[PDB]
Symmetry: C3
Subunit: 117 residues, 3 copies
């Protein structure tokens, strides 16, 4: 899975090790191994969420197979909100998630694509 | 709507309050309330646009319903170019926009997805 | 084409001129002119790739027509991995690519969309 987190928290207010703890959280929530989880955190951005510049975070989750229905994404959403509200000390009104299904022909790995691996 | 702006302008050359003025602009252009507009600005990046590293900006716009046809996106494009060329003091050759339709099962909000709200 | 590169290398460890050399590389690999290539590099991020925070890079490639099959993307992947492993001095285990097809109604250029140009 690919997780990308944009936040207007400065880098020195993002907890040390967040990118590693998010790998372990995503592994349990999405049912994929932690060594196949990829996390990108982009702090110190200028953001408005719901029209407000108070601290906030945007998470994008992309994966093959597991983020492609409302019923699956409702479950994933509940668990990611619990994790992030605690780690970032944000209210649930200050986080949004987007889910993007991927197919194997879209993922370039070790000089080929996943269709052939 | 979700608006993401990448620019090679340094943070101290991006006008103060741009993320808030872009909420109000997007509200009028896309016909959605300003309190449902989300803006992310990422300044100080290394960019080439049309092969050139002169100051430039990339805007991504994602929304349910309203960015899914050529005729709608032509109108949105004209209005966003007018707003951004003035705010950033860039020529129209230095801006590109990408439009991405979303569906309600893709948006995680308050621990669920929008399909159920 | 649109190329977006996220890396946990600090800005002062990314080779000067990478955004320009990536325009020339993408032109040859994707068969589009260098003056239609757009590159965004975001350095200094907090990243884990395959569960590890060692130096790594994520590349996203979006284009009309040329990134929409496994056979095309296998070729593109091989060439981009050769370019990036040398430029960033990373192993092939530390890079992933995502490919995204676009349609002309999604691209805002000079105040319209590409459908009308």
């Amino acid at each position: 899975p690919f997780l990308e987190l944009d936040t207007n928290l400065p880098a020195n207010r993002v907890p040390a090790g967040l990118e590693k703890r998010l790998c372990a959280a995503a592994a349990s929530i999405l049912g994929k191994p932690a060594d196949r989880v990829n996390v990108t955190v982009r702090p110190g951005l200028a953001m408005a969420l719901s029209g407000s510049t108070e601290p906030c975070a945007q998470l994008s989750i992309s994966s093959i197979g597991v983020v492609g229905t409302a019923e699956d994404n409702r479950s994933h959403s509940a668990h990611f909100f619990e994790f992030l509200t605690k780690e970032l000390a944000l209210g649930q009104d200050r986080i949004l998630i987007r889910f993007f299904p991927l197919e194997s022909w879209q993922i370039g790995k070790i000089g080929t694509v996943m269709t052939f691996l």
